[PDB]
Design an enzyme around this catalytic site. Structure first.
Site, PDB file in Angstrom:
ATOM      1  N   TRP A 101       0.840  -1.201   0.000  1.00 46.95           N
ATOM      2  CA  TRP A 101       0.000   0.000   0.000  1.00 46.95           C
ATOM      3  C   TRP A 101       0.872   1.246   0.000  1.00 46.95           C
ATOM      4  CZ3 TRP A 101      -4.219  -0.086  -2.095  1.00 46.95           C
ATOM      5  CH2 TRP A 101      -5.075  -1.196  -2.062  1.00 46.95           C
ATOM      6  N   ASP A 171      -1.580   6.468   6.264  1.00 41.06           N
ATOM      7  CA  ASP A 171      -2.635   5.598   5.769  1.00 41.06           C
ATOM      8  C   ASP A 171      -2.911   4.530   6.840  1.00 41.06           C
ATOM      9  OD1 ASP A 171      -4.284   3.786   4.536  1.00 41.06           O
ATOM     10  OD2 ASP A 171      -2.957   3.474   2.755  1.00 41.06           O
ATOM     11  N   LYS A 195     -12.259  -1.591   6.393  1.00 41.26           N
ATOM     12  CA  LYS A 195     -11.461  -2.599   7.101  1.00 41.26           C
ATOM     13  C   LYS A 195     -11.796  -2.676   8.587  1.00 41.26           C
ATOM     14  CE  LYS A 195      -9.113  -2.796   3.134  1.00 41.26           C
ATOM     15  NZ  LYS A 195      -7.738  -2.338   2.742  1.00 41.26           N
TER      16      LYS A 195
HETATM   17  C1  LIG Z   1      -7.557  -1.530   1.509  1.00 40.28           C
HETATM   18  C2  LIG Z   1      -6.412  -0.513   1.711  1.00 40.28           C
HETATM   19  C3  LIG Z   1      -6.350   0.567   0.841  1.00 40.28           C
HETATM   20  C4  LIG Z   1      -7.334   0.752  -0.299  1.00 40.28           C
HETATM   21  O1  LIG Z   1      -8.626   1.166   0.125  1.00 40.28           O
HETATM   22  P1  LIG Z   1      -9.761   1.408  -0.936  1.00 40.28           P
HETATM   23  O2  LIG Z   1     -10.942   1.977  -0.184  1.00 40.28           O
HETATM   24  O3  LIG Z   1     -10.094   0.084  -1.567  1.00 40.28           O
HETATM   25  O4  LIG Z   1      -9.236   2.396  -1.953  1.00 40.28           O
HETATM   26  C5  LIG Z   1      -5.369   1.504   1.015  1.00 40.28           C
HETATM   27  N1  LIG Z   1      -4.461   1.386   2.019  1.00 40.28           N
HETATM   28  C6  LIG Z   1      -4.511   0.336   2.885  1.00 40.28           C
HETATM   29  C7  LIG Z   1      -3.466   0.247   3.998  1.00 40.28           C
HETATM   30  C8  LIG Z   1      -5.499  -0.615   2.732  1.00 40.28           C
HETATM   31  O5  LIG Z   1      -5.510  -1.653   3.615  1.00 40.28           O
END
Ligand SMILES: *Cc1c(COP(=O)(O)O)cnc(C)c1O
Ligand SMILES: *Cc1c(COP(=O)(O)O)cnc(C)c1O
Lengths: 360, 360
Positions: A101, A171, A195
């Site tokens: 990511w 993030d 998540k």
């Molecule tokens: C799932 C995830 C993303 C992507 O999220 P989306 O809503 O599908 O764009 C980005 N960063 C991390 C750390 C993730 O686990």
């Protein structure tokens, strides 16, 4: 009659939240409307919308000077919107490169302006998180971005650097509100909600308001942070059912004892699975270094791809969902976000033991 | 115990859809998971995701060469994403200016590149839609954008121009799937789902695939149409519960007799209210010309602001929601999207009659 759900994104919601939302899905609080049929500028939706923000901050110790935004487009849209807002000409977006990511985030930033890799664990094939306590950056750094939990590799930072006047951005898609952290270390944190906070379709962005008081005026209105700050995320129609569901998850998190409570519970879940790997006489092998282990996404392999394929199919047939790891990592991934119950983890380690011995 | 819901966005959903989704909200098809807890790359979610696309096309006569995309960010994000993808340097984005949502769309396009107003009803204070059957455009036109239904002014096009090699693009947020139209007239149509298709948090974009085969490579990944086409709107996590709810609404629309059926039903609803206005001896006055009347958002005034304020409060107290018009228009707006039942419309005209006589 509840699946052992180890999906990595979208993922488990607490059953209690599902039941509460089911119960008032057709008629919310005797209004004769679903929350989904209400105006986002009405008092009823607004109470939910504003409550969610306050509860989120409260879980984090309620530091002043931060605004909770609800933005559509997932974390992936933040990968662009962050440098669009903060990567001024002549400045450099610095990234900490810890796996899949981080790499996605860097790639987007390069479309927008100058980037730099300020730290990387690629030399350990992302097994060993980089030490950030130092890190050197320039004056012309726009920000330092890191990924708090690398969802695919299974690595997670326990702590974050003090970056001074360079805003730190995180993030936190796969670990937000799983553990206490000091929001004041960050200029911005973000997370797709799907998540650890609820439904897909909402991204939580928490931003230091002094950093976004005047967003770049050349940007599309919907890609400016001030559009969301100044309009309380209601400049246009928000993902209102998703925010309602985040509010319900936040209530549940508080019921579970807040971030310190869920952290303890998650540490217990994680410890059970890591112990099953570590005590497996090598049959199961963790993908990352012990000191980089995530408590949200536990990645591990078997001695061969064939065994991993057998694990995946046999687990699926015993009602486990989502354990197959990403191809880049291979092996298995147990995603064990807040709402994944200890009971699923128990079932998983029991299965891991049965599988191992049925191969023995 | 169902409100007379005339909200303009988010808006009514069919009760049957709410009840179906409520019933399987905790456990979808005995999977032991909610649809919200499932992976968007899993077969179960994918069936819903793909079904929604097929049903949508089928409602429109299933013309070939079009892809249904599900994009986050609302129609407002399309206001930027459309010129980002189609407004090449040296080309001009042409807009038909019919009121508030056309104006919003134009404003965004100017951030991206050269625009032109190709037609306008501003000289009639947006009461008289422009005649488009002619319209002159240049060679260097990137597209012609119109708004099929001006949700705030209450005006609606009955038909659309043949624009030849200049792609025609339509913001159909407030009337999409309310009436048959020939999708082949358009290079792209779009709609936030929350007016006539379901939940907020999903935007339906239907695009001619030959127009987006290779999107501009300088754009953020999430703002390219080819990211959605080539990845079936699953490059990142989609708004999966919202798409599930759109699929349920599409099933309902087919149950109601498809676009030709809902159009007939909506014409009946609308005709009742316009008749109540037109037969009111001037007490109620339509905002737009008869030939520009919308069947989705019916706008009208009383002889004074004071009377309109009384109407709004008294209607609210009798359980009508959402009738106050936007300030720019003033007066009242009855939003009567597909799912607003004839019964609510009956209640509304009965109320309109009672109010009028209680003032008489
Ligand atoms: C799932 C995830 C993303 C992507 O999220 P989306 O809503 O599908 O764009 C980005 N960063 C991390 C750390 C993730 O686990
Ligand atoms: C509501 C509406 C919009 C805005 O939609 P959002 O999803 O809130 O961005 C745009 N165009 C029309 C015609 C609308 O009715």
């Amino acid at each position: 009659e509840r699946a052992y759900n180890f999906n990595a994104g979208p993922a488990a919601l607490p059953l209690e939240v599902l039941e509460r939302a089911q119960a008032e899905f057709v008629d919310y609080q005797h209004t004769g409307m679903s929350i989904m049929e209400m105006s986002h500028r009405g008092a009823v939706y607004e109470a939910v919308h504003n409550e969610a923000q306050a509860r989120l901050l409260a879980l984090l110790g309620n530091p002043t000077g931060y605004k909770v935004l609800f933005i559509q487009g997932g974390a992936s849209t933040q990968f662009a919107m962050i440098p669009m807002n903060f990567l001024k000409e002549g400045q450099t977006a610095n990234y900490v490169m810890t796996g899949s990511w981080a790499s996605k985030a860097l790639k987007e930033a390069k479309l927008i302006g100058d980037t730099h890799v300020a730290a990387s664990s690629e030399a350990s094939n992302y097994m060993t998180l980089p030490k950030l306590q130092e890190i050197q950056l320039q004056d012309n750094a726009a920000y330092l971005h890191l990924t708090s939990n690398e969802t695919i590799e299974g690595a997670q930072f326990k702590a974050f650097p003090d970056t001074g006047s360079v805003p730190l951005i995180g993030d936190m898609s796969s670990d937000i509100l799983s553990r206490p952290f000091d929001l004041n270390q960050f200029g911005l944190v973000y997370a797709g909600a799907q998540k650890n906070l609820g439904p897909s379709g909402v991204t939580v962005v928490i931003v230091r308001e002094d950093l976004v008081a005047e967003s770049p005026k050349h940007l599309p209105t919907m890609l400016r942070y001030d559009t969301y700050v100044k309009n309380n995320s209601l400049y246009n129609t928000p993902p209102s059912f998703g925010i309602y569901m985040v509010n319900e998850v936040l209530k549940w998190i508080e019921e579970r004892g807040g971030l310190e409570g869920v952290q303890q519970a998650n540490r217990k879940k994680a410890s059970l699975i890591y112990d099953a790997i570590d005590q497996s006489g090598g049959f199961y092998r963790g993908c990352v270094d012990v000191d980089s282990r995530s408590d949200m996404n536990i990645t591990f392999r078997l001695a061969s791809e064939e065994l991993e394929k057998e694990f995946v199919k046999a687990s699926e047939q015993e009602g486990f969902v989502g354990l197959k790891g990403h191809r880049s990592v291979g092996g298995l991934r147990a995603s064990i976000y807040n709402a994944v119950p200890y009971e699923s983890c128990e079932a998983l380690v029991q299965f891991m033991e049965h599988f191992k011995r049925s191969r023995g």
